[PDB]
Amino acid sequence: KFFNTAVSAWMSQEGPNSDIVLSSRIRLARNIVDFRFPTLFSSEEAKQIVALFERAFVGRFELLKMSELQPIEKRVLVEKHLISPHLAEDSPFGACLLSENEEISIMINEEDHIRIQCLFPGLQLAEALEAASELDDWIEGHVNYAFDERLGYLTSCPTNVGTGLRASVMMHLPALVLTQQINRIIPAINQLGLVVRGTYGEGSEALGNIFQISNQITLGKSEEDIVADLHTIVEQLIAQERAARQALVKTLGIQLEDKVFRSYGILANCRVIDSKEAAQCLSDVRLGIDLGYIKNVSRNILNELMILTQPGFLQQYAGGVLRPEERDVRRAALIRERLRMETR
Amino acid sequence: GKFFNTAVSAWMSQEGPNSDIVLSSRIRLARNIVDFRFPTLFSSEEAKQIVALFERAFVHRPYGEAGRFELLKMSELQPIEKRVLVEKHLISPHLAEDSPFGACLLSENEEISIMINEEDHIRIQCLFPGLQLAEALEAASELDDWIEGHVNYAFDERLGYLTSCPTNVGTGLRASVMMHLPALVLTQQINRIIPAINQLGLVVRGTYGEGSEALGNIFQISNQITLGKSEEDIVADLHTIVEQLIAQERAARQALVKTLGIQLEDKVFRSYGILANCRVIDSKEAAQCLSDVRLGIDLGYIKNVSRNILNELMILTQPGFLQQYAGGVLRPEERDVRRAALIRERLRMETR
Numbered sequence: 001k002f003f004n005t006a007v008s009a010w011m012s013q014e015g016p017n018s019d020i021v022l023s024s025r026i027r028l029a030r031n032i033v034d035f036r037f038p039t040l041f042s043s044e045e046a047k048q049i050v051a052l053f054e055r056a057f058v059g060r061f062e063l064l065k066m067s068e069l070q071p072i073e074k075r076v077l078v079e080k081h082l083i084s085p086h087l088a089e090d091s092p093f094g095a096c097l098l099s100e101n102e103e104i105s106i107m108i109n110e111e112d113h114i115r116i117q118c119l120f121p122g123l124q125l126a127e128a129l130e131a132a133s134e135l136d137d138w139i140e141g142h143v144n145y146a147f148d149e150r151l152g153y154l155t156s157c158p159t160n161v162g163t164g165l166r167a168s169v170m171m172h173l174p175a176l177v178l179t180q181q182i183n184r185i186i187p188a189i190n191q192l193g194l195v196v197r198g199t200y201g202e203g204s205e206a207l208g209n210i211f212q213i214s215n216q217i218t219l220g221k222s223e224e225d226i227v228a229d230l231h232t233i234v235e236q237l238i239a240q241e242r243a244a245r246q247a248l249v250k251t252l253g254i255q256l257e258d259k260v261f262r263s264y265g266i267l268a269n270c271r272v273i274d275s276k277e278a279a280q281c282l283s284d285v286r287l288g289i290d291l292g293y294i295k296n297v298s299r300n301i302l303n304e305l306m307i308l309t310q311p312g313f314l315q316q317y318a319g320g321v322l323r324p325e326e327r328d329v330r331r332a333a334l335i336r337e338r339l340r341m342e343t344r
Numbered sequence: 345g346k347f348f349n350t351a352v353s354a355w356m357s358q359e360g361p362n363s364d365i366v367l368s369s370r371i372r373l374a375r376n377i378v379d380f381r382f383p384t385l386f387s388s389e390e391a392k393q394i395v396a397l398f399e400r401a402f403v404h405r406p407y408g409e410a411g412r413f414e415l416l417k418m419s420e421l422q423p424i425e426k427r428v429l430v431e432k433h434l435i436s437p438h439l440a441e442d443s444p445f446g447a448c449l450l451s452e453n454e455e456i457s458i459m460i461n462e463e464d465h466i467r468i469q470c471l472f473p474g475l476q477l478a479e480a481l482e483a484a485s486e487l488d489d490w491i492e493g494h495v496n497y498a499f500d501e502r503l504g505y506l507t508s509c510p511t512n513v514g515t516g517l518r519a520s521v522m523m524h525l526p527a528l529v530l531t532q533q534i535n536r537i538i539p540a541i542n543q544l545g546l547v548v549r550g551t552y553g554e555g556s557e558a559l560g561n562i563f564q565i566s567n568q569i570t571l572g573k574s575e576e577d578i579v580a581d582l583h584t585i586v587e588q589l590i591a592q593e594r595a596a597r598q599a600l601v602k603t604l605g606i607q608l609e610d611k612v613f614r615s616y617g618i619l620a621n622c623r624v625i626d627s628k629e630a631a632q633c634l635s636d637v638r639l640g641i642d643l644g645y646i647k648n649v650s651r652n653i654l655n656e657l658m659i660l661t662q663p664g665f666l667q668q669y670a671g672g673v674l675r676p677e678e679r680d681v682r683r684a685a686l687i688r689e690r691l692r693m694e695t696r
């Protein structure tokens with residue numbers, strides 16, 4: 001079942017630096033030319049492409065067609081970064097070829113005909129790129145990619161023209177945020193051409209201290225060079241976060257243990273919590289788990305509950321519009337329950 | 345021995361009338377002994393003779409159901425031990441800190457504390473759980489007469505018992521109740537009630553009397569009038585105002601439940617969440633959270649936490665008792681870590 005908001009067995013595996021790096025994501029955007037039926041209609045191209053993947057994937061993959069999913073199922077796929085918002089809503093023949101472990105997602109008929117996604121836990125960009133490239137090679141053996149031998153892969157949005165590659169890592173940087181170093185690392189990332197965004201919240205507030213660092217640097221660099229560059233910056237960010245964490249432990253000791261356990265205590269017991277406080281507390285709890293203060297709570301609580309406690313998702317899940325105070329009560333209840341599952 | 349290592353005696357652990365709000369009822373009777381100068385004037389020789397008088401008369405003396413009296417001399421106790429007795433409300437800060445020749449006769453059940461060389465030669469204290477002012481006054485008056493069979497009180501027909509303090513003039517009677525008034529505090533009402541009560545000849549003080557703060561919204565309501573009113577009327581008048589206070593607190597709770605609803609449940613559970621999980625907590629925060637949790641158990645929000653454990657924790661988390669329980673002296677930051685751990689384990693054993 002792909003619509004389990006919990007961290008998959010695949011994404012809960014401990015990849016390199018997976019305490020700080022939640023996940024590594026490789027996306028390869030492709031468009032197809034010279035269709036098997038040279039149709040003039042996008043409708044027909046989109047259906048041939050779906051037929052291709054339904055015929056060619058029955059490793060176990062399920063082809064999820066957006067037209068066949070309830071809106072909450074599509075929202076979960078969106079929140080799992082398995083599909084884009086555009087695939088859920090705006091793609092009449094949108095479909096997602098999902099591997100059973102949800103490592104592999106091939107979005108069909110979005111902006112581009114093909115978006116191959118590999119999502120790995122921890123810092124495994126090279127592994128994700130290799131896995132995405134193996135599917136890329138498989139797909140290209142059966143279709144012709146729109147490709148200009150001097151411009152590279154042709155993608156609908158010129159955001160991707162060239163390699164069609166977007167590489168991203170999601171990182172939890174509570175210590176850099178706590179010690180107010182985060183706005184020091186943003187310029188270093190921007191100078192290198194990478195893009196850093198908060199994953200959760202509205203415009204740059206980065207709830208949960210979860211950051212997405214991705215490339216933008218396109219035409220010049222090889223895919224391996226894009227990924228090596230991102231990997232290298234991520235490893236420096238990891239080192240900075242670990243240094244900040246170790247400084248925090250050495251300075252605060254029991255006061256840091258107290259901070260993360262109080263955040264735990266709020267999450268385990270509060271009856272009213274807004275998404276911002278929940279995010280801060282979840283980040284603290286995750287840090288406390290990472291530091292081994294909190295020993296009986298899965299670190300995946302951060303990944304899962306950051307999704308489930310978002311205001312819009314919470315309403316989407318509840319099936320209706322909820323006032324903020326109603327959201328805060330349901331959010332607290334959801335969080336308490338998920339932490340009660342950990343106590344058992 | 346057990347005076348220092350049990351936070352709440354079996355005696356004080358009994359549920360009393362209205363004991364959810366009224367934690368305790370106390371009657372103190374101040375007296376001086378004829379032929380001894382009062383503690384503000386006496387010599388060290390007189391002070392020692394006073395202790396010796398009470399020692400000879402009352403050490404190990406049986407007092408019925410209360411067990412026998414034990415004599416604790418302040419000079420023979422350490423400041424932590426004395427702080428423990430203050431924190432258990434068995435002796436006054438004055439006796440613990442300001443009476444070199446102070447002593448206290450404690451009943452084995454810790455209902456009775458006869459302080460010696462406090463502000464007066466004798467401060468007879470009877471402590472009852474819940475709202476039991478009539479029973480405490482009866483107990484104290486009985487004990488007063490019983491003691492007076494062994495000492496003669498300085499007494500003037502006009503001025504009553506001659507005491508050292510203007511605040512004991514006449515009856516020497518201080519009747520007090522300890523009340524948990526979290527709703528009146530939260531509704532801001534307490535701000536109007538305190539001056540209103542002060543104008544009726546009562547006074548509202550903190551948890552450890554004059555000059556102390558209301559730890560955990562625990563207020564001491566006591567008479568201010570000691571002279572020109574019978575002891576029964578002083579206590580009856582206090583009781584009447586305590587009953588009104590209970591009524592106001594209960595109404596304030598119902599008002600809070602209706603106006604805050606889940607936010608009140610959130611308030612108490614967050615305090616519970618702190619207590620169950622914090623690793624560092626000072627006694628003041630602990631008291632505030634314990635107050636919230638007590639309110640939460642009173643309103644039925646919080647299950648599996650007894651008033652008994654909350655009573656124990658209110659005492660165990662005090663600095664002296666913490667150091668007593670620890671085994672020795674603790675700096676503030678050590679206290680806060682041991683306090684958090686004590687609370688966590690008591691709350692976790694409370695929920696198992």
Ligand SMILES: N=C(NCCC[C@H](N)C(=O)O)NP(=O)(O)O
Nearest residue numbers: 274275276310311324325327328
């Ligand atoms: N915005 C809210 N709640 C509003 C409460 C006011 C303020 N945040 C407070 O809690 O004090 N919830 P959401 O689901 O995170 O949007």
Ligand SMILES: N=C(NCCC[C@H](N)C(=O)O)NP(=O)(O)O
Nearest residue numbers: 624626627628663676677679680
């Ligand atoms: N006075 C204190 N603590 C002072 C603050 C120390 C701070 N929590 C810290 O960790 O240093 N505790 P007490 O036992 O209530 O007297």
